[PDB]
């Protein structure tokens, strides 16, 4: 739901990131892609 994600590709990516945020604030996404636990 942010302009950089639109720049990466599509509005569908914005929807996916919004779904991540609504789920856990992108906690699982950040952990899975980067390996850092935001909320230990």
């Amino acid at each position: 739901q942010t302009n950089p994600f639109y720049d990466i590709g599509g509005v569908s990516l914005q929807n996916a990131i919004g779904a991540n945020i609504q789920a856990d604030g992108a906690n699982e996404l950040i952990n899975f892609t980067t390996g850092v636990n935001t909320n230990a």
């Binding site: 950089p4 994600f5 950040i30 850092v36 935001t38 230990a40």
Partner: protein, 55 residues
């Protein structure tokens, strides 16, 4: 989000995690010493009560 803010917050949370881990070790020893002292005092109090009853 963005490109640089994500990396910045990831680095910051890593550093905060390390520092808080050290502080957690310190606080854990704090509570361990507290519990040991409390147990010793409680045992001594029980001994004193038994002595008073016998007296």
């Amino acid at each position: 989000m963005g490109g640089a803010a994500i990396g910045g917050i990831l680095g910051g949370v890593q550093l905060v995690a390390g520092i808080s881990q050290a502080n957690s070790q310190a606080n854990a020893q704090r509570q361990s010493l507290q519990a040991q002292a409390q147990t010793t005092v409680d045992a001594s109090r029980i001994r004193q009560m038994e002595i008073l009853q016998a007296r």
